[PDB]
Amino acid sequence: AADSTGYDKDLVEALERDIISQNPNVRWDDIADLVEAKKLLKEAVVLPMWMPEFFKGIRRPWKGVLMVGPPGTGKTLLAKAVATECKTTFFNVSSSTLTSESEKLVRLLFEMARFYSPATIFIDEIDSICSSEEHEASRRVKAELLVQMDGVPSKMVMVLAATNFPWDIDEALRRRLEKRIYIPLPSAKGREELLRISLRELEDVDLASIAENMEGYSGADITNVCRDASLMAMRRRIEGLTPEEIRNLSKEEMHMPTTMEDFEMALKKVSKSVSAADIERYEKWIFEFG
Numbered sequence: 196a197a198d199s200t201g202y203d204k205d206l207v208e209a210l211e212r213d214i215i216s217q218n219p220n221v222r223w224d225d226i227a228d229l230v231e232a233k234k235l236l237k238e239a240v241v242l243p244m245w246m247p248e249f250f251k252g253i254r255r256p257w258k259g260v261l262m263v264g265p266p267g268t269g270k271t272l273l274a275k276a277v278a279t280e281c282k283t284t285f286f287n288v289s290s291s292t293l294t295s296e297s298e299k300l301v302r303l304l305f306e307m308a309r310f311y312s313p314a315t316i317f318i319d320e321i322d323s324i325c326s327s328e329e330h331e332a333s334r335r336v337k338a339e340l341l342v343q344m345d346g347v348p349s350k351m352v353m354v355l356a357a358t359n360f361p362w363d364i365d366e367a368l369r370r371r372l373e374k375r376i377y378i379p380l381p382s383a384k385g386r387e388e389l390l391r392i393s394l395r396e397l398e399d400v401d402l403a404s405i406a407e408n409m410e411g412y413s414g415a416d417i418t419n420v421c422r423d424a425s426l427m428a429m430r431r432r433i434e435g436l437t438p439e440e441i442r443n444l445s446k447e448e449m450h451m452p453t454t455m456e457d458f459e460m461a462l463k464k465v466s467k468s469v470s471a472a473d474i475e476r477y478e479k480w481i482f483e484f485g
């Protein structure tokens with residue numbers, strides 16, 4: 196990880212600590228409910244690295260990928276999953292990081308991926324790149340993203356991106372993200388697999404009930420419920436008396452099987468976030484843009 200610069204080492208270091216990672220890994224197993232998207236990704240990005248000269252007049256015209264969908268449905272997880280298959284250096288970039296002159300980060304980001312051999316750039320929440328003197332910050336940055344993105348054999352740089360609000364992306368920005376993919380909320384079989392992933396070290400119609408009680412919850416919400424519920428059992432009972440002394444390390448009493456009541460209490464905390472009216476918009480966007 197050694198590079199020449201004409202930049203502020205402050206900016207260069209921020210990037211190194213926050214954006215760049217190589218060891219961070221995500222197996223495809225660990226992502227549930229996306230069997231079709233995984234195929235699409237693997238074709239657009241992974242396979243083209245395994246057989247480059249094989250792609251000629253079927254070369255994947257896709258330069259970058261846009262994944263579309265509501266919050267917390269596995270989009271970042273998929274992006275990480277590619278970088279671990281391909282053993283590339285992973286750049287997890289927010290669009291907030293880009294905004295905070297402010298352009299130079301974008302030019303640096305790509306200039307760092309270029310040197311860092313095979314890279315994968317993932318630009319989260321790229322809706323926000325667009326939309327008086329403050330909005331001028333965003334127009335100069337969008338300008339530099341579109342110039343850099345055209346810069347896309349093991350010197351390969353991949354450009355994945357993600358948005359909750361796809362309808363806020365103009366034609367100029369569409370040309371750069373040729374492949375589009377819908378990452379919906381988990382299906383009934385999808386939501387049940389997600390629970391198998393999260394509850395695997397803890398404590399079916401039980402979990403199908405739970406899965407069937409979700410119905411419009413994102414993968415992130417379901418994971419939290421498990422976190423909460425998993426934690427709920429022992430609190431109210433085992434240390435409900437709150438004896439500071441007594442709660443010493445008495446790990447003999449470790450088995451505290453988490454109940455159904457817990458998952459029903461956990462469910463009450465957060466109510467469904469994404470309306471069927473919101474999903475209408477996603478359904479429509481991939482209609483014409485996929």
Ligand SMILES: Nc1ncnc2c1ncn2[C@@H]1O[C@H](COP(=O)(O)OP(=O)(O)OP(O)(O)=S)[C@@H](O)[C@H]1O
Pocket residue numbers: 225226227228229265266267268269270271272319320357389392413414415418
């Ligand atoms: N299909 C899934 N399989 C496993 N975990 C999931 C899944 N979907 C969501 N999650 C949870 O929520 C995160 C999924 O990544 P995503 O949140 O979709 O990426 P994102 O939607 O761009 O992220 P945000 O919105 O910036 S927090 C993980 O940390 C998981 O705990």
